[PDB]
Design a protein around this motif. Sequence first.
Motif, PDB file in Angstrom:
ATOM      1  N   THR A  71      -3.418  61.242  56.116  1.00 23.41           N
ATOM      2  CA  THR A  71      -2.821  61.464  55.336  1.00 23.41           C
ATOM      3  C   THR A  71      -2.043  60.522  55.059  1.00 23.41           C
ATOM      4  O   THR A  71      -1.652  60.112  53.367  1.00 23.41           O
ATOM      5  CB  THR A  71      -3.574  62.938  55.010  1.00 23.41           C
ATOM      6  N   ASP A  72      -1.733  59.712  56.389  1.00 23.00           N
ATOM      7  CA  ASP A  72      -0.222  58.390  55.479  1.00 23.00           C
ATOM      8  C   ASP A  72      -1.660  57.844  54.244  1.00 23.00           C
ATOM      9  O   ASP A  72      -0.120  57.358  53.440  1.00 23.00           O
ATOM     10  CB  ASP A  72       0.434  58.263  56.727  1.00 23.00           C
ATOM     11  N   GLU A  73      -2.715  57.206  54.598  1.00 24.96           N
ATOM     12  CA  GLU A  73      -2.925  55.988  53.936  1.00 24.96           C
ATOM     13  C   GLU A  73      -3.662  56.836  52.784  1.00 24.96           C
ATOM     14  O   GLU A  73      -3.008  55.602  51.647  1.00 24.96           O
ATOM     15  CB  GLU A  73      -4.646  55.377  54.553  1.00 24.96           C
ATOM     16  N   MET A  74      -4.078  57.942  52.715  1.00 19.40           N
ATOM     17  CA  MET A  74      -4.311  58.579  51.600  1.00 19.40           C
ATOM     18  C   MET A  74      -3.432  59.409  50.496  1.00 19.40           C
ATOM     19  O   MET A  74      -3.396  58.810  49.514  1.00 19.40           O
ATOM     20  CB  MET A  74      -4.754  59.856  51.877  1.00 19.40           C
ATOM     21  N   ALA A  75      -2.790  59.858  50.896  1.00 16.69           N
ATOM     22  CA  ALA A  75      -0.843  60.400  49.723  1.00 16.69           C
ATOM     23  C   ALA A  75      -0.580  58.675  49.279  1.00 16.69           C
ATOM     24  O   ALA A  75       0.112  58.555  48.186  1.00 16.69           O
ATOM     25  CB  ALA A  75       0.126  60.726  50.740  1.00 16.69           C
ATOM     26  N   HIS A  76      -0.154  57.816  50.094  1.00 14.74           N
ATOM     27  CA  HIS A  76      -0.110  56.128  50.051  1.00 14.74           C
ATOM     28  C   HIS A  76      -1.144  56.131  48.628  1.00 14.74           C
ATOM     29  O   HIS A  76      -0.812  55.432  47.226  1.00 14.74           O
ATOM     30  CB  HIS A  76       0.145  55.033  50.565  1.00 14.74           C
ATOM     31  N   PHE A  77      -2.612  55.622  48.814  1.00 16.07           N
ATOM     32  CA  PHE A  77      -3.266  55.832  48.107  1.00 16.07           C
ATOM     33  C   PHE A  77      -3.126  56.364  47.034  1.00 16.07           C
ATOM     34  O   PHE A  77      -3.390  55.757  45.538  1.00 16.07           O
ATOM     35  CB  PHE A  77      -4.315  55.609  48.259  1.00 16.07           C
ATOM     36  N   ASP A  78      -2.668  57.795  46.614  1.00 17.80           N
ATOM     37  CA  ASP A  78      -2.804  58.857  45.480  1.00 17.80           C
ATOM     38  C   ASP A  78      -1.354  58.245  44.606  1.00 17.80           C
ATOM     39  O   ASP A  78      -1.436  58.870  43.841  1.00 17.80           O
ATOM     40  CB  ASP A  78      -2.261  60.218  46.668  1.00 17.80           C
ATOM     41  N   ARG A  79      -0.572  57.738  45.359  1.00 15.21           N
ATOM     42  CA  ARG A  79       0.781  56.881  44.527  1.00 15.21           C
ATOM     43  C   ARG A  79       0.419  55.725  44.748  1.00 15.21           C
ATOM     44  O   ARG A  79       2.205  55.300  44.289  1.00 15.21           O
ATOM     45  CB  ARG A  79       2.244  57.441  45.258  1.00 15.21           C
ATOM     46  N   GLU A  80      -0.288  54.618  43.985  1.00 14.35           N
ATOM     47  CA  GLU A  80      -0.380  53.449  43.757  1.00 14.35           C
ATOM     48  C   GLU A  80       0.376  52.866  42.291  1.00 14.35           C
ATOM     49  O   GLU A  80       0.779  52.196  42.371  1.00 14.35           O
ATOM     50  CB  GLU A  80      -1.845  52.882  44.125  1.00 14.35           C
ATOM     51  N   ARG A  81      -0.301  53.878  41.617  1.00 13.89           N
ATOM     52  CA  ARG A  81      -0.033  53.433  40.168  1.00 13.89           C
ATOM     53  C   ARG A  81       1.526  54.299  40.354  1.00 13.89           C
ATOM     54  O   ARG A  81       1.889  55.368  40.159  1.00 13.89           O
ATOM     55  CB  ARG A  81      -1.220  54.521  39.224  1.00 13.89           C
ATOM     56  N   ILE A  82       1.687  53.183  38.620  1.00 14.54           N
ATOM     57  CA  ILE A  82       3.182  53.279  38.089  1.00 14.54           C
ATOM     58  C   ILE A  82       2.847  53.363  36.799  1.00 14.54           C
ATOM     59  O   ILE A  82       1.261  52.594  36.551  1.00 14.54           O
ATOM     60  CB  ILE A  82       4.657  52.558  39.002  1.00 14.54           C
ATOM     61  N   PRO A  83       3.781  53.610  35.109  1.00 16.30           N
ATOM     62  CA  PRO A  83       3.883  54.015  34.130  1.00 16.30           C
ATOM     63  C   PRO A  83       3.448  51.916  33.925  1.00 16.30           C
ATOM     64  O   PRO A  83       4.250  51.324  34.315  1.00 16.30           O
ATOM     65  CB  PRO A  83       4.905  54.727  33.755  1.00 16.30           C
ATOM     66  N   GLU A  84       2.205  52.106  33.088  1.00 17.86           N
ATOM     67  CA  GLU A  84       1.988  50.418  32.933  1.00 17.86           C
ATOM     68  C   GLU A  84       3.670  50.570  31.573  1.00 17.86           C
ATOM     69  O   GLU A  84       3.962  51.693  31.130  1.00 17.86           O
ATOM     70  CB  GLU A  84       0.528  50.317  32.073  1.00 17.86           C
ATOM     71  N   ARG A  85       3.719  49.049  31.001  1.00 15.32           N
ATOM     72  CA  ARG A  85       4.707  49.322  30.016  1.00 15.32           C
ATOM     73  C   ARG A  85       4.083  49.857  28.081  1.00 15.32           C
ATOM     74  O   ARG A  85       3.105  49.580  28.188  1.00 15.32           O
ATOM     75  CB  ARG A  85       5.018  47.642  29.514  1.00 15.32           C
TER      76      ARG A  85
END
Lengths: 498, 498, 498, 498
Positions: free
Chosen positions: B55-69
């Motif tokens: 869950t440490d790894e998957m929770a971070h994978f789940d949050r990789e993306r930020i809004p694009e410009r």
Amino acid sequence: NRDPASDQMKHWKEQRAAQKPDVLTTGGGNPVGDKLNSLTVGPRGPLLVQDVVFTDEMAHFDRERIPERVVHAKGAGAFGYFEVTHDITRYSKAKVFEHIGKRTPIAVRFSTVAGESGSADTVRDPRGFAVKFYTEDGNWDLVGNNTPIFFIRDALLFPSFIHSQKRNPQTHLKDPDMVWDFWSLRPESLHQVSFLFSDRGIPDGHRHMDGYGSHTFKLVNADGEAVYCKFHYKTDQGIKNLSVEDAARLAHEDPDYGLRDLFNAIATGNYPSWTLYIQVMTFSEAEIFPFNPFDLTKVWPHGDYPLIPVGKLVLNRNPVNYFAEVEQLAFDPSNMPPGIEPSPDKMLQGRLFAYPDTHRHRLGPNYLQIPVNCPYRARVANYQRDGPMCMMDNQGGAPNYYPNSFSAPEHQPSALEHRTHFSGDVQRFNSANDDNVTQVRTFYLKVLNEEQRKRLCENIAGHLKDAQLFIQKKAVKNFSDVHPEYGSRIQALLDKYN
Amino acid sequence: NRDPASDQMKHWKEQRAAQKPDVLTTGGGNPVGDKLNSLTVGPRGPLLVQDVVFTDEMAHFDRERIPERVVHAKGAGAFGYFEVTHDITRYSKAKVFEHIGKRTPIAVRFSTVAGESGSADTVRDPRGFAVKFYTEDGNWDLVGNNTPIFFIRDALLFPSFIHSQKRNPQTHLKDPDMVWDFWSLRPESLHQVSFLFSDRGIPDGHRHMDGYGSHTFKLVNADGEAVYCKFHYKTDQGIKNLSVEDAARLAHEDPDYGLRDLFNAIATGNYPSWTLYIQVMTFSEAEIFPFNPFDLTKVWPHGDYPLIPVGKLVLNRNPVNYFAEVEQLAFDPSNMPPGIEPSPDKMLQGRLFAYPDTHRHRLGPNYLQIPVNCPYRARVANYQRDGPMCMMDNQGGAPNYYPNSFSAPEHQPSALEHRTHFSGDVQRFNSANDDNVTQVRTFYLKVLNEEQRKRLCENIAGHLKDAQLFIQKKAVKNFSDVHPEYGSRIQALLDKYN
Amino acid sequence: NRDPASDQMKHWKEQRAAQKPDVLTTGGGNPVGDKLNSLTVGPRGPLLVQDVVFTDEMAHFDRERIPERVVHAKGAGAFGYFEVTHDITRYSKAKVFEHIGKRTPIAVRFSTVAGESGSADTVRDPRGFAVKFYTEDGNWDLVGNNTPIFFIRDALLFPSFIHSQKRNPQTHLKDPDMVWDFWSLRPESLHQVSFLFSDRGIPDGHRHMDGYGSHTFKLVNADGEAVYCKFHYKTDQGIKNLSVEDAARLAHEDPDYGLRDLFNAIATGNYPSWTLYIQVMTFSEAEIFPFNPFDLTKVWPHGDYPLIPVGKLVLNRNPVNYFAEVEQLAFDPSNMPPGIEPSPDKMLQGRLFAYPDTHRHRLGPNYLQIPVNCPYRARVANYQRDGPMCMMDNQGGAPNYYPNSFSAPEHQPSALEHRTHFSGDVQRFNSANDDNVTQVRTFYLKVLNEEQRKRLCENIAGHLKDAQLFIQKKAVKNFSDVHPEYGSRIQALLDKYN
Amino acid sequence: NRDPASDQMKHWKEQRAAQKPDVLTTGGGNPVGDKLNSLTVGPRGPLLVQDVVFTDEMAHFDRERIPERVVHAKGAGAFGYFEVTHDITRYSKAKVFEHIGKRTPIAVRFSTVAGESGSADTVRDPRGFAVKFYTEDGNWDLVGNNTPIFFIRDALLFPSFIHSQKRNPQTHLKDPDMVWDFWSLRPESLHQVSFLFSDRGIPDGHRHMDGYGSHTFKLVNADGEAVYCKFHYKTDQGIKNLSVEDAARLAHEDPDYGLRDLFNAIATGNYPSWTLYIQVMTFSEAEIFPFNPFDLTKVWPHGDYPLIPVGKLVLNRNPVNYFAEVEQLAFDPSNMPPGIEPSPDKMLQGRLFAYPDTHRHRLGPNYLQIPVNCPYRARVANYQRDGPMCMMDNQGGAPNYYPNSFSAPEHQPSALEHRTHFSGDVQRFNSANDDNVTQVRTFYLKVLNEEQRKRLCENIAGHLKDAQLFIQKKAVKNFSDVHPEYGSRIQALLDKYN
Ligand code: HEM
């Protein structure tokens, strides 16, 4: 002169007597010409968008606040060290314990439970006592309380329990109907309710109370042999409590009594310390324990499981910036180095999930990159990348998939979890009707004396009297189930309130 | 061997041939025993919550993306230096210019406009050319484009203009009706539409195009005397463009042609450079200019306002981690050190607000603490505190209000803005009916030759043919208003499409 | 007239032919006097903060973008119904199936996997085929793919696998070394890699491909009897694929070919449909299956486990606003009504966590209150409260703790999950060396013909040619392990590339 | 029976006396079999990821909290109507005023300033009194206080002033050195500091205090004629204050005294009301005013500018869910319908930016779609799209660019702002040394009597005693500047503390 806490700014200035003040800048590092007067067309003219000094400052002011902790919102922090004094290497291979005299830096946060950020320190409530150990094998968070036990023994009850303590959803008031309806319907709560309404319900500051891990944990040695354990950290300053009268006065007189007491103690060199102990229970003894040894409403009797000394926790440094170093502090029970593992305690299993999950919300996906949260004594190397407010090199150009042929980080078999056997149906097993009264009777009759029993029953009656009669009746029946006189004492006090 | 970009991992490994791979850890720094197999009860049994590695790894994978410009989402970055070669200290006191040979580190990001993160580099679109100068007086962001002009001259039209370029709100397709309805109704766009559909609409990579500040800015010297200026940075590699046929092929063949070309150029020591120039216009000349000299649809003719050399922009370092160093790069036009100030250009005034505002959303309130955004050559000292993902000491225990008696940071009068006089009614002045055609006629007839005029009219007809006839007719009327033959050329091509 | 998609604005205009366009307002509902010209002091004067029309609009524009999906970013949506055609009530008590003719509203999203929001539709990649059933027992999300299998069988490999398929962390380019290093090291991927590089790697839009649940699930009937199942939804329009040459051309010619095709089909009343089948396997049959029946890299052969018809999926409604209705769509495999339950599939167990987790990040804590995500055909009643962007009455003044004596919502024993027995050690059990070749041999030799084998080997060679020779060699060895001629075919093609 | 607030749950239960409690569901609408016991492998076995009931509930609990307001965190809300009683249509064309008897729904939030969400109601502090009018021309937010004036007159001092009133950045304690250093250095604060330490510093709940707009605003009539105004809303229940001794007791006895009092008043039909007045000042009168008529530290004397009645504010509806309806309430001073406009007040100009800005942080980009924030009595139609947690149809398939030829919403010239003339340099003009003492002298000598002067000086001395002597001395000098005896009274009290 006043107390050290009061002279914070005076001492900052004196330290910086010959500093030559810094130039005031925007967030972008541009020097500011006049930060006291807005940019207008004429002296009584409109404000311009061109005033980028004003909007830089105001936009940041507008974003100062982050969500408070869903629980334990009100707290105090300090830093120091853990020092090993005794050898428990027969029980745990964890690097933190590995030789006598070995020091590990710690962070500590003390708190109430129910009150929000503006509430008073000297109220009746359990106290958080969370310790972060910055070990070579990463962070170990021992997220403890000033009690060895809790109100419930399954994490599905936890949101409800907290809701029942916190404000009415319509009125936004504290609601004795919510408090006692939940507690009367869930008599597993009788043990910790008994602790809570005793004298140790209002400690004299954070330095005069004990810490406990509360949960059963597992220790694994260098041979792969496991035992179950409990963590106890006893105050070297001694147990001291405030009377309900004194606690009430300090509530309006100094809502921040706990913060002030801890800061001044450290500033004057009166560093508080605790002795960390373990109790050890063999897997064989866990089979024979007359309760569930994983039941968070139960203690291990000291007679049968004596305290084994481990070392010293010492707080010798105040925070320099409270928001950065305390408000942003994040403790995860799931942060455990090799040699320390969870037990099947249903409550603990729930905490393995809840803390990193709320931290990703309250702080952000990259909360472990906040300096106070950083495992700064370990090399963090893995296949995790990106996310908002990515802080360091984001591990540069390193191959970002596993397995790989390009020499990126490799797992370490010695770190594998200990092998324990389980057999059974996948089911929601009822834990409600485990023993709710036995250990509570020994506390009421054996641990407390007459005057403590009397204050205990006065403390409960004092609060329970505001609930409806049908709740009062159900509550008294639970106290009667522990001991007829515990019930009848409360009921007599209730009678002359009603 | 392949191209340097292709051998990224091979070179990472070779550099680390004797590295002794790092131990793979959780985010909390705990070593991982096996990151290839989940924790289950038996080999075909259910997954446990106790698998905190998963869950440490998957929770971070789940949050990789930020809004694009919101615009210029698709881009490429590099780092290098700005070197002063010539003396403009008579115009600007800005530390960046203060002596010949003085170097300032820069960050550069090149981009398209309309395409989202997965779109192709070699499409018809303006190009972003944003330069961050890390000066001693804080960051100076020159947020430029590969054109001296833009489509519109008031920021209230900007969201609409971008919407009209980006996807249909129902269908999610590119919509020629939206593109040409907006452009035909807003003929101020004729000048930049003429640039866009010329050969320089598809540059051969980022190294073969010019940069412009586009807006009129203000320069202030050590005497408090001001002039208006334009920034030009001309490619030392020379203007080179892709044919529509070649651009089309590379679109599916290498959507990342621009990224790859810039990386390889720097990796092989073929460092790209630009010469930075200013044009200077006196306040007196600004009164006499036959257009609004603050109108973003207008150029200053070189005949009347010759280019004045300033120095060299050189890109000599690739990003090591693209997400950390490029995707998180934040340019604010409002980042201007003393000696450089805004003009009343309505578009620029709008940008002073928009960029820090979108950055607080896309990145976070503390985006200026991301290392690539840090004014690392300036001491940031101010009365701003806290906010999410607060990264450093948060300025420690320093007095957090101004004014104060405790020696905290002080404003610096020399940094005050330049005094300019304004008189008039507070009103929404109509700018729609300023000259829309004059400078566009000189471009069509004088700047481009016959074969360039022919390709220009083919490029427009090629796209405009997909709009409804009533839009085609309105569009042609605008091109006719610049020159009858510009209109009739397009209309003949349109005729044999329809 | 053009295609219906092209005429979206034309049709919207006509449909309100009565006209009386709405009054243009701020977000606050205040009418706007002129949204084309900014508020300045004189016509060449500075922009005022008083222009709250500008700030209201620009601040919303600045905040348009949300994080794209971490995978399957690029997609198409449509709505319709599910109709039961056959009785499977002997297998599942789920209300969705309870009688023939029973209709349930559905939402569907089709996607690629690796590409970002700006990438092309007609590329080689698996296709997402996610179906949301709005049932009376809440939402059932069947988050399927156009393949019955996947590349890996343990969720701990998933972030790594996705990393390997996306951009180099330094270069930001697609990296054939990352793709084939991971696949060559993890030969469990051979089966789905064989599916991917076959003809069905590039479907002709979303209407001409099948959907699969892929995972083994559990069906439970009214008697509490359980079976394992696999969901298949076969296209009623028939399998149809694009040639690599045609897919390549459409990549640059119409990056949104899939979006356009689905919208136009529904717009012209050419509604696409699928027939839903299950395969059923007994608990006893699961013990005898010659492979792990929960291994995502395996199929249940149709001969041994024939398809059982259930009903019809029909898409008959286009989205009206793509962002609100499709970009914001959230599918959670954990959304399962009584009668449908998870199997021990390591991959599915992983997904029960990952989707609600990424949705709380990408969309927000209260994503299930977004109308397209709302279980609008069920009554949502529970003890959950508050969170950002809380949009309904937040369940009003209802008691917010459980249990309570005040008539708040009650658990429903008929909803209890099916009880299955497990015995084993808590361990990370290795699944890497389960059968990686057997079913892939039958696919290569039996399912495909000669011309299909040849195209398959051409498609692999054409990509693998850009990997280093040591990666080419290891990959070829894995294809050789399935059949020597599968290997030697690829190696011959590779030989004349190298 | 107790007070109505206490009986919230009792009443909720009775009102659904038919019963049939709802079925307990997940957020996804799936019914729950047992929400009291976690899913484990055997009764003393580990927690499964398969327990999606636990994760759904716990993940929502983990996300309950949002950032509290940066100021005015601690508050009470109620709803009712505004009724016009007098004709002010000669001053304002605003639809809200357009005929006598016309009703508008309102929302109201009362608050303290400095305290956090857990602080006490009955402390010395100004009181927020914010009113939202849901008008046909959109929302009008009159974000008022219980004082006609404020401590400062330039928005650049606001974050500093608030910092000085809150916690020491290192200690986290209230800091009398921060409070009085700022006030002693900024004597413009003398007027409101005199109001604050007077009897009306601690109102007896929210019903027994007045509201003021405080700022000068602009009213514009149907002829485009403008005047300056001040809004006063006087309590119909009468001014009533708590003694410092009584306020102190209620602080610890009922921290939520204000919440409780407002709820109970409305619950028992004792609806509180206020009478709305304006003061009117001509543009010519503004030129002759002996002070800056836009200076927030000044009042318009009633003798020269008498109160003009307008209508009645009535609160007759308690919130049903406090988080959804009150904690989530957002007031934007920039929400102004045609007929009401800002004045050049430096403080008001600052607020036009700050509130929508903090709301996009605290609540979200789409905060105006939260039902209590929705301008539900107006049609919102514009070119704004998307953003996180987009909750309505996002205006469907409407053309999303302006101008357009497709019948989308149109600006309305009658809504154009009033045109006023300004002449001057763009500069930061100093307002620190405007009259700081004159009106404060009249308040001290004329408005207060002897006993009130004595309590005032006792209240100041009682706080200022804890500041360093050099701060005491500078503060006393400022009180001396208003009148020697105001100073010497404080200094005598200070002398016997020190
Ligand atoms: C430049 C001066 C000021 C600034 C920058 C400012 C800024 C703010 C900010 C950021 C908030 C938090 C809003 C939220 O989270 O919803 C706030 C709340 C508030 N401010 Fe101010 N403020 C200023 C002056 C004033 C004045 C002069 C008054 C009254 C005359 C006032 C009354 C309020 C009230 C009543 C609230 C709470 C509204 C509610 O109940 O939700 N403020 N202010």
